[PDB]
Amino acid sequence: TLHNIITDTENVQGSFSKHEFQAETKKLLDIVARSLYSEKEVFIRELISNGSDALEKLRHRMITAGGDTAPMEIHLQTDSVKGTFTIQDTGVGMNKEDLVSNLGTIARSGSKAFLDALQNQAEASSSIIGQFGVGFYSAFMVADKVEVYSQSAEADAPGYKWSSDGSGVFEVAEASGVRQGTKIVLHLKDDCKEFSSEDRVKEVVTKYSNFVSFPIFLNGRRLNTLQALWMMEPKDISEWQHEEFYRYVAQAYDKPRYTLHYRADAPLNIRSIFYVPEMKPSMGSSVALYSRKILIQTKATDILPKWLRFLRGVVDSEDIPLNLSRELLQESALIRKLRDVLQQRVIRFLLDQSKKDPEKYARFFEDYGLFMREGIVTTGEQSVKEDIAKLLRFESSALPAGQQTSLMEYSSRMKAGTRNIYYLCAPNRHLAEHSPYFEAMKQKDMEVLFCFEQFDELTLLHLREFDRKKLISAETRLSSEQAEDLLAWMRNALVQRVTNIKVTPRLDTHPAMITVLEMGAARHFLRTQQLQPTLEINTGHDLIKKLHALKDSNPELAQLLLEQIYDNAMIAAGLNEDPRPMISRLNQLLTRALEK
């Protein structure tokens, strides 16, 4: 039942023509000026990156041809009356040829050609921003008219003025007295007047350009007072520096409980700092992606797994393949490898923390454990599930209350014969301990992990196996007649509440206790509060004898006592942490009990 029209029927007739690809220059200028970026305001990032590069080139040239130490800076000036934005740098400048060539040719990048000719070890290799040779045109998105004044450091070259409205044509004339470097004046469009506002420009500078190497001045005032901490040697950074830097990058007010300062060169140049905040859950609300100190993404997308989104901080890579918009990354095996690498690194880091300070790590796991569980559930690589699962903490049968263990430790206590991992996911200890399913493998000496946390169950279900070992849920006085009179009677006043009633000798201080056979039911019971309980009675307890003796004497009163015993055992089993519904009834019981 196929329908295909694609058939190999074409044959070349005659001789071929040769052509070269062309460009619709005027339309391309418009696309490059207006259609590259998600935001107009990005022309400021672009113009500042250009000033930086101009300064970096001058710095590079002074290594050999030492000149006059002139200060290396980027000045911005707003004029809210005229509607102008002006930026000036004291860098390398541009003679007439270079203005014509660099500014007049779409995609021509003098910075890229400069980079290509460097020693790979030159400091400038890693800090020159420009590649594509189009960022300058972003100015035309916000300006009706652009004027560029430039003076090169040269053979007494004259200064020049370059000017365009941005519609296919530009003009060049000689000028004086242009200071060494480059001044750019934007005459802002009516709908872009906000960029002649000081406060608005400041917002943009701090967003994208806050860690630019060279001093930025706005109307004569210094902005970028913050050092790119990630580019520094880990041991030259004090804890107070991290605390301040964390607060800044995470927009937080507390301190990091964990700090990881990760540096490496393969698969990419990476300089990074990750923080785990002190404060628990529930814009600066994730790890930012930088490149050569310029923000790429406020919220980095492709470099960390989703389960690590609770990390704050910064990743900077010099050689990460940038999308043309410079707010996205290109699809790349190197970026994928980076994510895998970072995932392993953070895992290793958190593991080391568990050893160094287990108590502190326990606090961490209580607050952030949900992310590990999420990671294990949502990832498809079995090897990855098992790496994240090393971070997991549980409780155990062969261990005291409150004390925690990992799967590896459990794995270390398994007799070399049997090779599978038994767990019981339950609301609490009392419920887990008194599980008939657990009582089975209590006699059969067999350690069982008690998993009390939310989503512990499907975490292990989605985990399936660990350490090539299998995880399987462990779910596969008063005479004797006086008691039976009582049990027959209690079984009637709670017909609509409990499936089963028993007697047990294992009770001491308690008149009764509640047990459950299905942990999944108790959870369904625990979350459903806008079950088949099985209470057991202590025939030696006073309240129970007092009950038996009372059902005949004060039938009304004896049922107050009964429901109290039931509710109390319910509370002991942690199946009723909000006993507000019982209080009035209890106050009635107490009162009737006290005809003293």
Ligand X SMILES: Nc1ncnc2c1ncn2[C@@H]1O[C@H](COP(=O)(O)OP(=O)(O)O)[C@@H](O)[C@H]1O
Our CB check for its own copies shows the closer of 134 and 421 to be 134
Cβ atoms 148, 89 nearer than 8 A: no
In whole angstroms, what is the distance from residue 204 CA to residue 41 CA?
Answer: 7
Beta bridge partners of 420: 470
Is residue 568 near its own copies by the rule CB under 8 A?
yes
Site for Mg ion in 118-137 (CB under 5 A): 130, 135
Site for ligand ALF in 111-140 (CB under 6 A): 129-136
Residue 137 marked in a binding site: yes
Is residue 52 near ligand X by the rule CB under 6 A?
no
Give how many residues touch ligand ALF by CB under 6 A.
Answer: 10
Phi, psi of 97 (to 5 degrees): -55, -45
Min dist. Cβ of residue 573 to its own copies (A): 9
CA distances for 416 relative to 412, 465, 470, 541, angstroms? 9, 17, 14, 45
DSSP 281: P
The kind and range of the H/E element at 206 are: helix 198-208
* Stretch binding ligand X (CB under 6 A), from 88-96, 336-344, 446-454, 538-546: 88-96
Is residue 51 near ligand X by the rule CB under 6 A?
yes
In whole angstroms, what is the distance from residue 355 CA to residue 372 CA?
Answer: 18
Min dist. Cβ of residue 48 to ligand ALF (A): 11
Is residue 62 near its own copies by the rule CB under 8 A?
no
Quickly tell me which residue has 């916000």 as its tokens.
142
Residues in the chain: 596
Min dist. Cβ of residue 269 to ligand ALF (A): 18
With CB cut-offs between 5 and 8 Å by kind, which of Co ion, Mg ion, ligand ALF, none does residue 7 bind? none
CA distances for 148 relative to 47, 171, 338, 486, angstroms? 12, 10, 41, 99
Our CB check for Co ion shows the closer of 113 and 549 to be 113
Our CB check for ligand ALF shows the closer of 51 and 181 to be 51
With CB cut-offs between 5 and 8 Å by kind, which of ligand X, its own copies, Co ion, none does residue 136 bind? ligand X
Widest pairwise Cα distance in the chain: 121
With CB cut-offs between 5 and 8 Å by kind, which of its own copies, ligand ALF, ligand X, none does residue 386 bind? none
Write the CB contacts of 366 (distance below 8 Å, at least 6 apart in sequence).
none
Min dist. Cβ of residue 135 to ligand X (A): 3
Name the closest residue to ligand ALF (Cβ).
135
- Residues 332-351, one symbol each (x = binds Mg ion by CB under 5 A, - = not), give --------------------
Residue 408 marked in a binding site: no
Helix orientation angle between 43-62 and 198-208, rounded to the nearest 10 degrees: 60
- Cα dihedral: 166, 172, 175, 178 (round 10): 50
Is residue 188 near ligand X by the rule CB under 6 A?
no
Min dist. Cβ of residue 13 to Co ion (A): 12
Ordered DSSP codes for 389-454: TTS--BEETTS-TT--B-HHHHHHTS-SS--EEEEEE-S-HHHHHT-HHHHHHHHTT---EEE-ST
Smallest CA-to-CA distance from 270 within 248, 298, 303, 239 is with 303
Min dist. Cβ of residue 233 to its own copies (A): 31
Residue 468 marked in a binding site: no
Min dist. Cβ of residue 157 to Mg ion (A): 22
* Stretch binding ligand X (CB under 6 A), from 3-11, 15-23, 86-94, 117-125: 86-94
Our CB check for ligand X shows the closer of 163 and 473 to be 163
Contact footprint for Co ion (CB under 5 A): 120
Contact footprint for Mg ion (CB under 5 A): 49-50, 130, 135
Contact footprint for ligand ALF (CB under 6 A): 46, 49, 129-136
Q: Can you say which residues are annotated as belonging to the binding site for Mg(2+)?
A: 46, 50
